[PDB]
Design a protein around this ligand. Structure first.
Ligand SMILES: *[C@@H]1O[C@H](CO)[C@@H](O[C@@H]2O[C@H](CO)[C@@H](O)[C@H](O)[C@H]2NC(C)=O)[C@H](O)[C@H]1NC(C)=O
Ligand SMILES: *[C@@H]1O[C@H](CO)[C@@H](O[C@@H]2O[C@H](CO)[C@@H](O)[C@H](O)[C@H]2NC(C)=O)[C@H](O)[C@H]1NC(C)=O
Ligand SMILES: *[C@@H]1O[C@H](CO)[C@@H](O[C@@H]2O[C@H](CO)[C@@H](O)[C@H](O)[C@H]2NC(C)=O)[C@H](O)[C@H]1NC(C)=O
Ligand SMILES: *[C@@H]1O[C@H](CO)[C@@H](O[C@@H]2O[C@H](CO)[C@@H](O)[C@H](O)[C@H]2NC(C)=O)[C@H](O)[C@H]1NC(C)=O
Ligand SMILES: CC(C)C[C@H](N)C(=O)O
Lengths: 464, 470
């Protein structure tokens, strides 16, 4: 009663694009410009983020080819280091990191979808929250209904967002070719905080956030046809296209709007559409909303698969990782992800906090590469269809420590808080995994709850 | 592993009640989703809408700069006008949206025949340099306004008896300079011109017919409100500057009455706020009131107009020998080698360029706030009563960040002594608001201060800011 083997190369490429393209391209430019000022500095920062993401994606493709198990970035650490680090990562993964990206993307989609109705006066927040909740509910419903439908939706929305970006690039090129210049030729005029590495890493945080989701295909592996050939091919097809699209869009943005008006603005896409169209200027917010819809739909699938694979190792209750007959879908995992995502609606502005815990997020990746090189060194027996030349993982980890050292040199108390949060998973781990021969009254209670959920949702244990 | 197997579930969960419960739960979920969508639609429709976009012109955005004479502005070697391109960075720092340029047409004192409105004076430069200046200004996004006073050298600016010939020549120069590429026109001493109202109406009609983004500036020395209103009978899109607001030197309530009466008579139209037509700020005010007037002019609902050198508080009485009409600009400590005298940083451009408590920094901050804020751009005006010598008003457009300005014209300290008396309920002032700046250093920034017991120092200005509320 295995799940399926249905994801093809095109489906994986579409999933990557949809996930990688969500709302960062339409929001993070303002923050990265305020934190860099010089358009050339912003462009080179985005290029550095792109090449770093390409490096990481290649290394993760190598690792996934080596270990053909579902739920990447977590199965590898479990294989290499043991049980404690894996559960320590997963405990905060299922609380903070995962049920925050979906909510933020849904909120951005809701805000941008209602922009034409309220062009000047800001939209009410309650309506945006309701629209985001409706979007999340509909997406989790369609994901639970089937797998092929989710893939078709992902491909359709990826095509839509690619067409939108192509139209933006064409408009920018037409504006450039009309015979008008800007501060692009005399760039680097201001170049502030050139020696201040704090602002540099602050801008790099937003740049890396805009590049997030590049490793989500490793979560859904063991479910795609012929992974050994399809995975690296999909990654190398997808990543450079994303980098090129991002840099071209950033270049096309500056040719229309001045630096001061970009910094003072709040919706650069809306201003670009208004300037270049005047009438029928509502297309851009609609396309942004569609892109965000596709991104959150892509993220939910990977989150559900990650929660599915983790529960098979006993780190999660046995009610999870419990497949459904007839249609093969992990209903409890999707329901849990949806209910956890909705729980963040009872919060104030969260974007300022999204940079929190990024240090640990990029730290776990570094340990994964260390585990990969450890396995490559001390275990020269596993069959490796793909082999990557050295000093590429070395450069990746060196960049990781360079990025992690600044987070300790500056804002240290804001790291110690949060670091205390990640360490708070020790008591729950010792209560739920290490502990054995617990008092029986809990045992039949959890058994009865699991049986009740079993009967209510009519699912089957993972027999095979 | 911790629950029923496949066969056990198949045997147990086969009762019709269970499938009925599942069907009911699915239906309940779908109707709940539909109800949530309906509630979202209801909350969308029952909400106030955005007000409007006034679609203001280019000159509604920022202040205007009156260069006037060129020799005094750039000191020695200022004959060539192309040298003003090296000063454009200073204007960009001042972020002014316009530039009133002095008369350049040929004029030999009162010789009407020897007065061409198309001939550029050789000492000023040539046509090619003028075109280069226009191109550089367009690249820097600064418009150019050129003055066409028929007699900028003689005592009578309108050539005395000659009225028809000068009218025809300036009428031709209208189209000539409009096709040359100018962005607006300015005339002065209209009060010394016979039946000039028809002339201004015709010139405004021609300028508007040529293009929609053009301007026409008029200047008179009449401070009579009735005379100004009469001059605006046949024209409503004309910017007129006069000495109406100047020559008062009295309490703040007098200025409040003057401004309120002008707004009431005009009808809340667009106006120009300037002390005079060609005079400096220091020509009518003491050194202790320059900052207060600078703060007041940048917040009134209109287009502020300043003369050259008044952003640094230049004074003509000091450094004697400089004519009051065209005092020399004090760029740096060596900007006036011809006349030795007082040299210090308090009165030099580069000297005040780094001082945070200098006039130039306050001018730059006020210009940025005026040019970047929607409420200061095209907001509303509402003035309420205050203490004996206090001027207070608020600005608010639709829903953006509101602004509150309080000025103390008195020379003694006093409490706020203010009441709400606010007509717009949506603009009602709360008890908490932030502070932006004050003319007298010694106060903090960004602290939410109670709007009830404000203590005002002599000659003090405030910039209270509070967010939109219900
Ligand atoms: C001024 O221009 C307008 C439009 O080209 C014309 O007159 C306007 O419309 C009526 C009809 O003549 C007048 O009563 C208005 O006063 C004019 N509008 C203005 C002056 O703003 C006509 O071509 C021109 N008229 C004159 C007297 O110059
Ligand atoms: C502008 O200043 C001049 C200079 O005093 C004054 O103009 C006077 O106008 C009256 C009639 O309008 C005439 O007697 C003379 O033209 C001027 N009187 C003089 C020179 O004694 C007046 O102060 C101002 N002009 C105005 C307000 O129209
Ligand atoms: C000038 O006087 C008042 C000052 O505002 C103008 O407005 C009048 O006063 C009340 C109370 O402030 C306003 O609410 C009304 O708009 C006006 N009341 C009337 C006209 O009865 C007034 O319009 C002006 N008087 C004029 C132009 O003759
Ligand atoms: C800078 O500002 C003015 C000129 O820009 C000057 O003010 C002097 O202040 C001293 C003491 O406060 C007094 O003697 C007079 O008020 C001014 N003296 C002179 C000679 O102008 C002065 O140059 C500077 N102000 C200072 C130092 O406070
Ligand atoms: C981490 C991901 C949710 C970010 C995604 N690429 C977006 O910009 O929407």
């Amino acid at each position: 009663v295995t799940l399926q083997r249905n994801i093809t190369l095109l489906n994986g490429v579409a999933i990557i694009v949809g996930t990688i393209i969500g709302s960062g391209i339409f929001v993070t430019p303002t923050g990265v410009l305020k934190e860099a000022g010089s358009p050339g500095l912003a462009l080179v920062v985005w290029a550095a983020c792109g090449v770093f993401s390409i490096v990481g994606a290649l290394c993760y493709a190598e690792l996934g080819t080596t270990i053909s198990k579902s739920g990447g970035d977590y199965a590898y650490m479990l294989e290499v280091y043991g049980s404690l680090p894996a559960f320590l990562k997963l405990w905060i993964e299922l609380l903070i990191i995962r049920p925050s990206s979906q909510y933020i993307v849904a909120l951005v989609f809701a805000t941008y979808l209602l922009k034409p109705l309220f062009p000047t006066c800001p939209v009410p927040e309650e309506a945006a929250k309701l629209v985001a909740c409706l979007c999340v509910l509909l997406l989790t419903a369609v994901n639970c209904y089937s797998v092929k439908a989710a893939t078709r939706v992902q491909d359709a929305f990826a095509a839509a967002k690619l067409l939108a970006l192509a139209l933006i690039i064409l408009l920018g090129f037409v504006q450039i070719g009309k015979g008008d210049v800007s501060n692009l030729d005399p760039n680097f005029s201001f170049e502030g905080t050139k020696l201040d590495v704090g602002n540099i890493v602050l801008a790099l945080y937003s740049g890396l956030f805009a590049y997030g989701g590049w490793n989500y295909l490793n979560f859904v592996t063991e479910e795609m046809i012929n992974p050994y050939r399809n995975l690296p091919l999909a990654i190398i097809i997808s990543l450079p296209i994303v980098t090129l699209v991002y840099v071209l869009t950033n270049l096309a943005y500056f040719t229309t709007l001045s630096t001061e008006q970009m910094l003072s603005s709040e919706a650069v896409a809306v201003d670009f559409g208004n300037y270049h169209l005047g009438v029928m200027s509502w297309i851009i917010p609609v396309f942004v909303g569609l892109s965000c819809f596709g991104s959150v739909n892509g993220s939910l699938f990977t989150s559900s698969r990650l929660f599915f694979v983790g529960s098979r190792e006993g780190h999660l209750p046995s009610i999870l990782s419990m497949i459904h007959p007839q249609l093969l879908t992990p209903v409890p995992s999707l329901v849990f992800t949806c209910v956890m995502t909705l729980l963040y609606a009872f919060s104030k502005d969260i974007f300022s906090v999204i940079n929190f815990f990024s240090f640990f997020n990029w730290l776990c990746v570094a340990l994964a590469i260390i585990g990969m090189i450890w396995l490559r060194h001390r275990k020269p027996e596993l069959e490796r269809p793909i082999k990557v030349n050295l000093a590429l993982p070395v450069f990746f980890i060196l960049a990781c420590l360079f990025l992690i050292a600044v987070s300790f040199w500056k804002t240290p108390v804001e790291c110690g808080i949060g670091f205390t949060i990640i360490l708070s998973g020790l008591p729950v781990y010792f209560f739920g995994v290490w502990w054995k021969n617990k008092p029986k009254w809990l045992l039949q209670g959890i058994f009865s709850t699991t049986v009740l959920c079993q009967k209510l949702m009519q699912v089957v244990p993972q027999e095979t | 592993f911790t629950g029923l197997s496949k066969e056990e579930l198949l045997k147990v969960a086969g009762s019709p009640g269970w499938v009925r419960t599942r069907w009911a739960l699915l239906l309940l979920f779908w109707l709940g989703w539909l109800g949530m969508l309906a509630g979202a639609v209801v909350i969308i429709v029952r909400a106030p809408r955005c007000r409007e976009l006034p679609a203001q012109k280019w000159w509604h955005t920022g202040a205007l700069y009156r260069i006037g004479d060129l020799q005094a502005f750039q000191g020695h070697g200022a004959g060539n006008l192309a040298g003003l391109k090296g000063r454009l960075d200073y204007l960009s720092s001042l972020k002014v949206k316009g530039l009133v340029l002095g008369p350049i047409h040929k004029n030999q004192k009162d010789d009407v025949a020897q007065t061409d409105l198309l001939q550029i004076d050789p000492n000023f430069g040539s046509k090619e340099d003028f075109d280069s200046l226009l191109q550089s200004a367009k690249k820097k996004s600064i418009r150019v306004i050129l003055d066409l006073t028929p007699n900028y050298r003689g005592e009578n600016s309108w050539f005395s008896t000659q009225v028809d010939t000068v009218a025809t020549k300036v009428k031709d120069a209208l189209e000539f300079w409009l096709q040359a590429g100018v962005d607006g026109f300015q005339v002065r001493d209209i009060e010394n011109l016979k039946d000039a109202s028809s002339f201004l109406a015709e010139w405004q009609n021609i300028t508007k017919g040529f293009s929609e983004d053009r301007l026409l500036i008029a200047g008179t020395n009449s401070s009579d409100l009735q005379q100004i209103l009469s001059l605006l009978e046949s024209n409503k899109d004309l910017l007129l500057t006069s000495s109406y607001l100047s020559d008062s030197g009295s309490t703040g309530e007098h200025t409040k009455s003057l401004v309120t009466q002008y707004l009431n008579a005009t009808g809340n139209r667009w106006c120009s706020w300037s002390l005079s037509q060609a005079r400096l700020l220091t020509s009518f005010l003491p050194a202790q009131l320059l900052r207060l007037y600078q703060l007041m002019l940048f917040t009134l609902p209109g287009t502020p107009v300043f003369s050259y050198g008044d952003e640094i508080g230049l004074d003509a009485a000091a450094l004697p020998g400089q004519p009051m009409e065209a005092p020399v600009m004090l760029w740096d400590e060596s900007s006036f080698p011809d006349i030795p005298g007082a040299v210090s940083a308090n009165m030099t451009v580069k000297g005040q360029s780094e001082d945070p408590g200098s006039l130039l920094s306050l001018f730059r901050r006020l210009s940025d706030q005026r040019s970047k804020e929607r409420s200061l751009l095209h907001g509303d005006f509402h003035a309420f009563s205050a203490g004996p010598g206090l001027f207070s008003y608020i600005r608010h457009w639709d829903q953006n960040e509101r602004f509150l300005v309080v000025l103390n014209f008195g020379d003694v300290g006093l409490s706020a002594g203010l009441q709400a008396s606010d007509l717009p309920a949506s603009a009602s002032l709360p008890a908490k608001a932030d502070l932006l700046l004050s003319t007298q250093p010694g106060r903090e920034e960004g602290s939410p201060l109670e709007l009830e017991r404000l203590k005002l120092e002599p000659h003090e200005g405030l910039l209270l800011r509070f967010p939109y509320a219900a």
